[PDB]
Amino acid sequence: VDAFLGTWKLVDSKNFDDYMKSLGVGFATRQVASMTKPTTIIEKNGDILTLKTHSTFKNTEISFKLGVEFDETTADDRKVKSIVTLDGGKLVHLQKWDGQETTLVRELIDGKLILTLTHGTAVCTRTYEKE
Ligand SMILES: CCCCCCCC/C=C\CCCCCCCC(=O)O
């Protein structure tokens, strides 16, 4: 997982409104989210990964072991059961709640971190660059 480690800043986003709307996020939160450029920090300490997402709007932090389920409260206030694994060199984060699922997939492509978010028919792509 070592190539994912570091500090990353958002530089491009496509279809995030569609993804938020699919999750039921209200229009006022979508407004602010469309103008926010988060910083994501990924760190490791032995087998424990910590993923921080910082912005002027909301901040989140989770710590987990790969392949072990954990409880997570998301930035939009869903209480989900999560698991993160490495699949084909990608970091795959699966969230389940109320019979629903969403995936947050991170892959490294030409030095950039590409985050693909899928829920329902909505697919959002967010591109991060390393700081
Ligand atoms: C912590 C800041 C995340 C981005 C601004 C706040 C958005 C909150 C609205 C819906 C959350 C949807 C699920 C999390 C999206 C994370 C996107 C990302 O890491 O770039």
**CATH value at residue 106:** 2.40.128.20
- Resolution (angstroms) stands at 1.0
Q: How many domains does the chain have?
A: 1
Which tokens go with 124?
């959002």
Query: What is the CB < 6 Å shell around ligand 1?
Result: 20, 25, 29, 33, 36, 38, 40, 53, 55, 57-60, 74-76, 115, 126
User: Which domain does 108 fall in, by range?
Assistant: 1-131
Placement of tokens 């569609």 in the chain: 18
> What is the number of alpha carbons within 13 Å of residue 82 lying toward its C-beta?
21
Placement of tokens 């901040």 in the chain: 59
Residues 6+ apart with CB under 8 A from 27: none
Contact 126, 8 (CB under 8 A): no
Separation of CA 75 and ligand 1 centre (Å): 6
Contact 106, 90 (CB under 8 A): yes
